Amino acid sequence: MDIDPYKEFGATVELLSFLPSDFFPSVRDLLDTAAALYRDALESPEHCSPHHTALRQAILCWGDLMTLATWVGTNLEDPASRDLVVSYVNTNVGLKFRQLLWFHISCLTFGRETVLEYLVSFGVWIRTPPAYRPPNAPILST
Amino acid sequence: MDIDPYKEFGATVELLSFLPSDFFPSVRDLLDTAAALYRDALESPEHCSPHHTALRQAILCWGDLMTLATWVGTNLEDPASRDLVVSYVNTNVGLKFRQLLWFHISCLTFGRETVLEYLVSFGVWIRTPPAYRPPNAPILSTLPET
Amino acid sequence: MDIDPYKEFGATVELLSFLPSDFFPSVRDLLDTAAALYRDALESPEHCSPHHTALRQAILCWGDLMTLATWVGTNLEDPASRDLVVSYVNTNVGLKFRQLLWFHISCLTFGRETVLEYLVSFGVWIRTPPAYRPPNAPILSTLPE
Amino acid sequence: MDIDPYKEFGATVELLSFLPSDFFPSVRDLLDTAAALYRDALESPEHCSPHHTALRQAILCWGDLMTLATWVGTNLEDPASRDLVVSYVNTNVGLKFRQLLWFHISCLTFGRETVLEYLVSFGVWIRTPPAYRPPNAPILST
Amino acid sequence: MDIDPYKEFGATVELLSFLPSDFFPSVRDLLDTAAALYRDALESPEHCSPHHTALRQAILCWGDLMTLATWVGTNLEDPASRDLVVSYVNTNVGLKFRQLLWFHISCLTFGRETVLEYLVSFGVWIRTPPAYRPPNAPILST
Amino acid sequence: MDIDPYKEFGATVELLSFLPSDFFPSVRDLLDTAAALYRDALESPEHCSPHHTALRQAILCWGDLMTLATWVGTNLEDPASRDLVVSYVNTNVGLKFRQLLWFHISCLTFGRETVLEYLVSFGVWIRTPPAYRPPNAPILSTLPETAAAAA
Amino acid sequence: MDIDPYKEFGATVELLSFLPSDFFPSVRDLLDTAAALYRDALESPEHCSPHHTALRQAILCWGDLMTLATWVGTNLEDPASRDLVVSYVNTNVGLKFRQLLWFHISCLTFGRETVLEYLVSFGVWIRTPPAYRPPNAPILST
Amino acid sequence: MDIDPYKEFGATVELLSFLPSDFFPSVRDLLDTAAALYRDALESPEHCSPHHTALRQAILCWGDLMTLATWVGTNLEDPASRDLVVSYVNTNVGLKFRQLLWFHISCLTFGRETVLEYLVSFGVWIRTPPAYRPPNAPILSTLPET
Amino acid sequence: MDIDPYKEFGATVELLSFLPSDFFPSVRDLLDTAAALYRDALESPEHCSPHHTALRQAILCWGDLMTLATWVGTNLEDPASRDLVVSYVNTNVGLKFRQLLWFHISCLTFGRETVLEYLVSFGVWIRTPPAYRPPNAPILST
Amino acid sequence: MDIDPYKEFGATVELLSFLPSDFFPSVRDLLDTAAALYRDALESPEHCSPHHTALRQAILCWGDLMTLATWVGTNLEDPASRDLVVSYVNTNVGLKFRQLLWFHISCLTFGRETVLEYLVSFGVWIRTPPAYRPPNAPILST
Amino acid sequence: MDIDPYKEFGATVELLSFLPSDFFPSVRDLLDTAAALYRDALESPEHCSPHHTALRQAILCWGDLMTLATWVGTNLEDPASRDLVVSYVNTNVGLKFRQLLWFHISCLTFGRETVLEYLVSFGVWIRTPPAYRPPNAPILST
Amino acid sequence: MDIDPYKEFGATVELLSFLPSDFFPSVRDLLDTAAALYRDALESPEHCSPHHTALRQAILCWGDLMTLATWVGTNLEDPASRDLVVSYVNTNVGLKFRQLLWFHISCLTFGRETVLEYLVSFGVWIRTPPAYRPPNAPILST
């Protein structure tokens, strides 16, 4: 099964894989900034743009998953199951939601083409050895 | 925060909350029908309508959840914990995902207006107690069948 | 006084008398649908129709009643008295508010004339003895079937 | 000296008796419906239709019978005669008043064109064995 | 209900109470002339006015009470209950039916205006003491 | 004598022979509906249609047969003769009277052509074995317009 | 009820009762003459006159009665009961069929007006005392 | 001498084999419905259409077989052979005459195209397994009491 | 039922009965001619003329007779009954099939009117005495 | 589901609560005024403005509370809870009912915007100390 | 290489997976129907539709497989090998060939769009629960 | 029942019977070239020519046969069945599918009429004995 939501937006999973793991901000920060900056748009009952529709469903799923995590932590009996599962819910799938939400927020704030250019720039910058590339990573901003 | 995902489409969780279980086909069946019918449309790099994007996001979420469930099943040793968590996932979250997918298919195949009208009619029908409620449930389907 | 809110809409308490008690559904099933179907209209500052104004007044009155019920549950110690009072207010006047909400909601959604037609049809249906009446009791539905 | 009040209308006593007794609902239901629907028309000083007048004298006649029943129940001593009279009044002429009130009210609400076709196809549908007639009884409805 | 059927015809019982009882004719003799004048008209399916319908319905109720009388005479033995019932029927219902029939027959035969004027004149006549009221009671006629 | 009373209107004895027993209403029910429906037409002195005169003659015949049944019931002593005769008269030709009266009534009310169409509808549907006969039979009285359907 | 099949054709049972019994010759001869003269017209699928269709049902009824008579004759054991039943078929109800057959055949073959004239002539002829009446009874002829 | 009588109407003997045997109605009932549906037409001296003449000759040879059967039943001696021959003629030849008669009656009364439609509909219906086929088998009926 | 195939073609069984037996050729001698002359026409799916359809039905019923005969000959055990039945079927109804085939084949080949003329001529010729009939028999030929 | 009904008329509860309590005349005065001045207006089946509908709903709640108080007084036993809940209902929601009733009555009788101006003016004035303000509280009047 | 014959018709093999097996009729019935309906068309030398050619190769390789089955069953000595092979080829390959034949035949008879509509409707029907679906399984007919 | 696909294409097995065995190339030698030349054409949803569909279904049937044979041979332990079945399938019907593939490919690539001429010339060439047959076997090419 090969399904790619970024395909409609012009990007692809492997292209997004150029960016390495675990440098993203915490998903909680992403939610906080989106609320502080996109509170009105999300609450609107009209499809203001394609990105809002996906982000809404992603946020709902993230909330339900966090509720599942807290409920299992509060109700399961043994310590091994509880710590293993609560650590698991924030291990790999959390990275998935984190990267998806980062992509949607960045594209909404700047634009898909700018995000693709930043992706390619980061890929070229990271591919080279550290001994030659500059010590400042590319920064997404206007 | 507080967001109603169905609100963009005009419906609400409370409106669908009238819908009881046993009028939603199983999630696996929704996957089967969606993959069989709308595969070319879904895989397209053009967003033809918000329904497709929402459906795709739900499909990804459900697939990830099933991956989580099988991963837990492979490793957990305590039968009670693993069976309890898998049942929880299949009954609580499964209900929500199944409701959403059914709503998306119904809206896409039958149209927005028809689905909302049928939902209001069903809500009116379900509230009346059995003593005065007609026994023939309203059913809308693509079949010219009586 | 002898004042009937239904009297100026064309309906009447005696006319609504056809529907027997226990027919109307739970109040919460009225509140949830009213909210999730006319939230903006109720919250809007425009009195489009008297139905909305009556529904707003009923909402406030019922909320006040429930606040009083929670108060008496929270403060008083006499258990039998509090149970009797909450039961009385929840069952007796609750029925009146419930039918009020049902009437206005149906009139708004389907039309007052259709509501009156449905009332007379239900009266005809219910008066007939069980031995001859069909099981298909009349029901309004913007949907065909 | 042969008088049938239905004679001025299209119906006839034997034709209206075509339907089986016990199908007409209790008299209290008829009176309550008639009140709730036509209090103003009955109280009006105008004769908008002969049906209203016929119903008016029907109501007065029934009230006289009810007063007779109340008086006989109040004064007389023999329980045998009392129960005999009350049962006879409640059952025998009760049927006639029920039929009369039902006819007038139904004709007014739905018109003669529907009542004189509801007295046919019903009482006819009853005769047919429950194996070739339509599954359910017909109902003057809306 | 609170129905005064006379109010439809313009009069009311309060006004009609001017005529004191014992100045009305016997029911049998009144029915005699009513029939002799409008037999076919009552029996016809044509309804020229509410008077005919009311007369028909009143005749029907009178026949019902006669049926009750013959039933009770045929069944019961004791004389007290029987003759008390007969007295009640001839007293309460008798006066009301007799005045109703007289009013309707008179207004149909001569008109509503003449009969109303007659009631007014009879009232003003009967108010005055006998010492001054003329000894020829007013009579509606040709 | 080769006489076909139905052949005047097109039908035949052996065509209506299709209609199954325990289908027609009892004769008394037919009398109650016919008198209650066409009282004046039957009582009228005008040959408005052959159906009316046919029904009138059948009514007279049935009245005479009932008079005979009452006579045999109230007079004869032998119980065996009594019950044999009454059962015979009630079952054998009373069924024929039921048949004729119902057919005439349906023709007059529903129209003659429709009656023949419904007759052939049974003639086909009833002829099928139960393994292929649907359990939903061709109803004729469209009068009630279904009065709504069941399930 | 009282229904007269001769009512439609202009005659009435009251008038037709003038003719005394033994006047109508016999069922067998009526059937024979009907076969000899008008047999074919019965089978035509067009009703040329109301007499033909009524004659059809009269013949069917008489055949049914003959079958009933012979069948009951073959099965009953008590000779007295069977003999009495056979006596009944030609006594009461056979006379009715003979009367109907005579009326219809005469009306068809000579004509209705001539039939009525013959009835009236026989009525005037019979009443007169035998000592003065002529011995040549009226008979319809061509 | 390889002749298929149904061939010129557009039907075929093997195509007609779709309808299972024992479904076709009794010979006597088809005979007496044909009688009091087409007495005049069969009796007429005009060859209106091949339907009527084919029916004429079919019923003729069927009556000839019936006469032979009764003659042998009356005349021959041993019961076993007589009964065996009667059953043979009534079951085997009776079936073919029955199907011939049914096809002609149905096509004449309702038309050939209607008969073809009914045949193909019944084929698609019967091929369906019982667990999935509905119990509402098709029946041609100019009566629209559907 | 009284059904005669010859009636539609204008002939009758009584007419063909005029031709004596022993002249009509064996059924096989006609089947061979029909095959060898009109195999293509018979096998065609076209209802060219009623003659062809009638011949087809005749051939089918004949073949069913033949199948029955061979079946009984092979299966039945009693030689006497077998011989009796085969002789009966072969001789009695064989004459009828011979008449049918001869009539249809001749009418198709030369024309129905010509065939009828041939039948009448042959009948009158055979009826004629030898002293006066022409010295040669009448034979049908091209 | 928090609602401020005055928002659709234009005002807000906080604007109304800006004014002090115990200023409006007792509830009975308002009820007597409303009755005596608008009996026919409220009893009429015409809804002139939302004022009347709101007033009628207020009267319905007021009657419900009165019947509840009578019930609790007659049925419950302990005086302490009785009087306590009586005082609670009379002070807490009684104030709101009185405020709403007075507002609607005054706005109906004298005007909406003028009543709003009176409210704001008196609210600002009462907070104003006795410095540059007349020693007579503003009084609303025609 | 990946080949999907339905993709030439616009459908897909996976799409056909809705209809659960135990629905596709036995191969023999499909072959009998195809022959009975299109004998001459299949034997024809003209390509009147692609469906005809496709069904032609379907029948051809089906016949080759049947020859394989009969050959291996007749020739081999070991029972397990032969019966296992025949059973497997009858069940697994039989399913695919049967569904291919049914699709071709139905599409040719009714039309491609009608077959697609029937397939999708049946799928939807069987997916849903009972109380939410009509009780009549869809069935295509012309 | 029996179909010759080549008749639809104008040829016959008898015509191709001229081509001897062990003359067609290997199955792979045709399949690989057919793929390399018409992969996009076959994969397209458009049926440009019947040859393409026939080739597609031939490849499907052959691939299913090969898959089944390989799977069963991998399962079964007996060597006789495995080797004999492999040889049989690769020999007889393998040759048949090979010849069909070659025919369709040649007709597609050089043109059907050219194929017919080449086969005719090949037959004429091969008939003659080798003593006079030239050593340059006719070959179809550009």
Author numbering:
A (entry chain A), D (entry chain I), E (entry chain J), G (entry chain G), I (entry chain E), J (entry chain K), ...: 1 to 142
B (entry chain B), H (entry chain F): 1 to 146
C (entry chain L): 1 to 145
F (entry chain H): 1 to 151
Kindly provide excerpts from the paper associated with this entry.
The HBV core (or capsid) protein (Cp) is 183 residues-long with an all-helix N-terminal assembly domain (residues 1–149) and the C-terminal nucleic acid-binding domain (residues 150–183). Cp forms a stable homodimer, where 90 or 120 Cp dimers assemble to form T = 3 or T = 4 icosahedral capsids, respectively, with the T = 4 complex the predominant (∼95%) assembly product. The icosahedral T = 4 HBV capsid has 5-fold, and quasi-6-fold (icosahedral 2-fold) vertices, where the 5-fold is composed of 5 A subunits and the quasi-6-fold has a B-C-D-B-C-D repeat. DNA-containing and empty HBV capsids are trafficked to the nucleus by a complex of importins α and β (Impα and Impβ) to deposit the viral genome or core protein.
To examine structural changes of the Impβ-capsid heterocomplex, focused reconstruction of the quasi-6-fold regions (also referred to as hexamers) of the capsid was implemented. To perform focused reconstruction, we used the particle coordinates of the I2 density map from the high Impβ sample since these complexes were geometrically defined and biochemically had the best chances of having their quasi-6-fold sites occupied. The capsid particle coordinates were symmetry expanded so that all 30 hexamers were independently included. The six “symmetric” classes were pooled together to produce a 4.0 Å hexamer map. A hexamer model was flexibly fit into the final density map. We found that quaternary structure changed at both interdimer contacts and at intradimer contacts. When dimers were aligned on the basis of the two copies of helix 3 at the dimer interface, part of the four-helix bundle at the intradimer interface, we observe that helix 5 of each monomer has rotated so that the Cα for residue 131 in the loop is displaced by 4.5 to 5.3 Å (5.0 ± 0.4 Å). In contrast, the focused Impβ-bound hexamer reconstruction has a pore diameter of 9.75 Å, expanded more than 1.5σ beyond the simulation mean of 7.60 Å (orange). In the focused hexamer, the CTD density of 1 B monomer allowed the model to be extended by five alanines beyond Thr146, the last residue with a defined side chain. With the C terminus extended to residue 151, the B CTD was long enough to exit the capsid.
